[PDB]
Amino acid sequence: GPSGSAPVLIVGGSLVGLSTAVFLARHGVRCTLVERHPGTSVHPRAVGYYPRTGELLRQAGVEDAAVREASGFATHRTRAGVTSLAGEVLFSKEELEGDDDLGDLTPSRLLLLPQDRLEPLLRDRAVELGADLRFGTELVSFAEDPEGVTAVLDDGTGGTRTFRSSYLVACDGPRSTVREALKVPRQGRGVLSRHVSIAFGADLRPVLGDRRYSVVHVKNPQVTGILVHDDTLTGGTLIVGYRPEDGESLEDFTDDRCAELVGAAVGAPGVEVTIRSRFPWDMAEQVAESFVHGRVLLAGDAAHVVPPTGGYGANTGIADAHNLAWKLALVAAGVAGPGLVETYDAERRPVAVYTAEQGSLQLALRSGTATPEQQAAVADAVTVTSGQAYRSTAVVGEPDGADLPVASDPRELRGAPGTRAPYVELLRGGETVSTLDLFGRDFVLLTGEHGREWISAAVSASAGLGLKITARRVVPGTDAGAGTLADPDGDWSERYGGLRPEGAVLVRPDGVVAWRSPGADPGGEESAVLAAVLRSVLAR
Numbered sequence: 001g002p003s004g005s006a007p008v009l010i011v012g013g014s015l016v017g018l019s020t021a022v023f024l025a026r027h028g029v030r031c032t033l034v035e036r037h038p039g040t041s042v043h044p045r046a047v048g049y050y051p052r053t054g055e056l057l058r059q060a061g062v063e064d065a066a067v068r069e070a071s072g073f074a075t076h077r078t079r080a081g082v083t084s085l086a087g088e089v090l091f092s093k094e095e096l097e098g099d100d101d102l103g104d105l106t107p108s109r110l111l112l113l114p115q116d117r118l119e120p121l122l123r124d125r126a127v128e129l130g131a132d133l134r135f136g137t138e139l140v141s142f143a144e145d146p147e148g149v150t151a152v153l154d155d156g157t158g159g160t161r162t163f164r165s166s167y168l169v170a171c172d173g174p175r176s177t178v179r180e181a182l183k184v185p186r187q188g189r190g191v192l193s194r195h196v197s198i199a200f201g202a203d204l205r206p207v208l209g210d211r212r213y214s215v216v217h218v219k220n221p222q223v224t225g226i227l228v229h230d231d232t233l234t235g236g237t238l239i240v241g242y243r244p245e246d247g248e249s250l251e252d253f254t255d256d257r258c259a260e261l262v263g264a265a266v267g268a269p270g271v272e273v274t275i276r277s278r279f280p281w282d283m284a285e286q287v288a289e290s291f292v293h294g295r296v297l298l299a300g301d302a303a304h305v306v307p308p309t310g311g312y313g314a315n316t317g318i319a320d321a322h323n324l325a326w327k328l329a330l331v332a333a334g335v336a337g338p339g340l341v342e343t344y345d346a347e348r349r350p351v352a353v354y355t356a357e358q359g360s361l362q363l364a365l366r367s368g369t370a371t372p373e374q375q376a377a378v379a380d381a382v383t384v385t386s387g388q389a390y391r392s393t394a395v396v397g398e399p400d401g402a403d404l405p406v407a408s409d410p411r412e413l414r415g416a417p418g419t420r421a422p423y424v425e426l427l428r429g430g431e432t433v434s435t436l437d438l439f440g441r442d443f444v445l446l447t448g449e450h451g452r453e454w455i456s457a458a459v460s461a462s463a464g465l466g467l468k469i470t471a472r473r474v475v476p477g478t479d480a481g482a483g484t485l486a487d488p489d490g491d492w493s494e495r496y497g498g499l500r501p502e503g504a505v506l507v508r509p510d511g512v513v514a515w516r517s518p519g520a521d522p523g524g525e526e527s528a529v530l531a532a533v534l535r536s537v538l539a540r
């Protein structure tokens with residue numbers, strides 16, 4: 001029998017599915033999420049979230065909560081190699097070199113928060129916004145027809161139930177039920193190496209003393225691996241490899257064998273070790289050839305598995321959720337055509353390919369197997385995560401505008417179409433407001449001081465297309481009043497690419513520039529031009 005319907009069914013309740021639920025619910029889209037596990041993750045995989053992801057958590061309403069939960073990890077500022085935690089230090093450096101001078105580009109910083117503490121924050125936020133989260137519930141099969149998707153659900157309580165949606169968003173991980181049902185092929189290097197993550201309890205306070213590490217590379221004759229200690233210094237995760245080609249297998253990782261390895265990594269006799277969880281995983285590079293299959297969308301690790309060297313995977317998946325959610329909201333609202341959904345593939349798949357390659361390059365670099373060309377190809381994590389340029393029907397390039405790389409120095413992009421609309425602190429009323437805090441719900445049009453023709457065009461297009469558009473003139477200095485944003489520094493038009501006083505920029509709900517005009521329309525047809533821009537972007 002039926003167990004309901006909703007515009008969107010989300011499969012998977014890890015970071016990408018929970019993020020999808022939050023962003024859809026924030027746009028007022030009713031969704032149901034199914035997660036086979038009885039609750040959120042027991043074994044944390046992700047720990048590091050780059051500043052763009054911090055900006056996306058702020059849009060989600062959970063960044064401040066995450067930063068408060070992470071306050072113990074805030075001191076873990078050093079990456080190190082050691083023989084053991086008790087033993088000799090082999091190298092020591094900063095975890096993210098210039099985390100300290102990001103302030104010109106973003107108000108966020110590197111966030112270190114284990115995944116098992118971030119997921120509950122997203123879960124509680126999704127529930128507050130009205131998402132229907134069904135844990136202990138597995139998607140078994142589905143079928144698409146011209147009007148929707150019918151899913152078969154198993155909550156273990158005997159019999160299966162059907163669910164009917166308009167869209168199915170597969171956030172169901174590297175072995176995606178949905179991707180495999182659809183027989184979507186994946187490209188890339190495939191499986192490179194086999195690993196186990198060993199979550200452990202051990203009192204490390206006497207061994208670490210006052211030292212606090214982000215990540216520790218351990219190398220001694222008994223164990224080679226990565227240790228990440230927790231904020232209370234009473235446990236962590238030891239990540240090791242094994243080689244089936246040498247007769248090693250997962251079966252080898254008994255509790256006793258895991259405790260031996262953790263003890264060897266800690267290096268202090270008499271340290272009592274508790275094994276909390278053993279998480280097997282493969283180091284892999286595999287990207288789906290397409291992320292949109294009619295009414296079925298692939299997001300996160302269902303769409304792309306990247307080598308975890310560089311910590312890009314959850315960052316990339318949360319940005320996928322953020323890209324798709326506003327698009328499904330506008331299609332479900334009847335304000336956009338279904339072509340807008342296809343742009344999820346056009347925009348996120350090339351990022352996924354680039355990011356998967358970056359993970360692979362980091363792995364080559366750390367493995368000492370990197371050619372001089374592969375070394376030169378490694379990008380800054382802020383370039384990978386903040387420097388993206390989209391090409392799709394939801395981006396309208398300037399006539400003179402040139403084709404941008406998939407990712408490049410974010411400091412140079414200066415609000416080009418398809419890139420992140422820059423962070424500028426402006427004034428509204430008596431408050432400071434970030435450009436970033438204007439974005440996340442509606443289209444936003446920001447104009448120069450003399451941009452009233454573009455403002456008028458936004459008011460007209462809003463009525464004509466049934467679309468809310470926030471439109472403001474940005475006025476340099478502090479001599480500004482109601483209906484404007486003040487730009488005390490006079491930085492805004494330069495940071496947005498040298499917009500003239502009559503110029504304008506149109507920002508999508510995801511904070512990506514859709515379109516800009518340096519000045520007035522040459523033909524004085526601002527109203528017709530902005531309407532045509534929005535019709536193209538909205539696939540109508």
Ligand SMILES: Cc1cc2nc3c(=O)[nH]c(=O)nc-3n(C[C@H](O)[C@H](O)[C@H](O)COP(=O)(O)OP(=O)(O)OC[C@H]3O[C@@H](n4cnc5c(N)ncnc54)[C@H](O)[C@@H]3O)c2cc1C
Pocket residue numbers: 011012013014015016017034035036037045046047048049115137138139140171172173174176177197239281299300301302308311312313314315316317
């Ligand atoms: C050791 C390690 C370290 C990492 N460190 C970082 C890091 O620091 N930063 C970072 O950004 N990323 C990191 N990553 C990557 C990150 O963990 C993943 O990219 C991320 O978890 C993917 O999220 P997801 O929601 O797409 O998939 P998953 O986390 O794989 O979750 C998928 C969910 O779907 C559920 N599911 C599957 N099939 C079904 C079904 N049929 N019905 C219902 N539910 C289903 C599963 O139970 C699971 O809970 C790391 C990964 C590893 C392995």
Ligand SMILES: O=C(O)[C@@H]1C[C@@H](O)CN1
Pocket residue numbers: 042275276277
């Ligand atoms: O669920 C289990 O079987 C164990 C219990 C805890 O140690 C975490 N994992």
Ligand SMILES: OCCCC[C@H](O)CO
Pocket residue numbers: 222223224225240241242243248249252253261
């Ligand atoms: O570096 C420690 C990894 C050992 C793997 C294990 O020995 C498989 O049998």
Ligand SMILES: OCCCC[C@H](O)CO
Pocket residue numbers: 043044045046047114197199228229230235236237
């Ligand atoms: O408890 C240590 C923090 C979590 C680390 C994570 O498990 C690494 O994948």
Ligand SMILES: OCCCC[C@H](O)CO
Pocket residue numbers: 427428429430478479480481482483484485486
């Ligand atoms: O003099 C300070 C100006 C405040 C700006 C105004 O509130 C624009 O919205």
Ligand SMILES: [Cl-]
Pocket residue numbers: 306307308309310311312313314
């Ligand atoms: Cl990763």
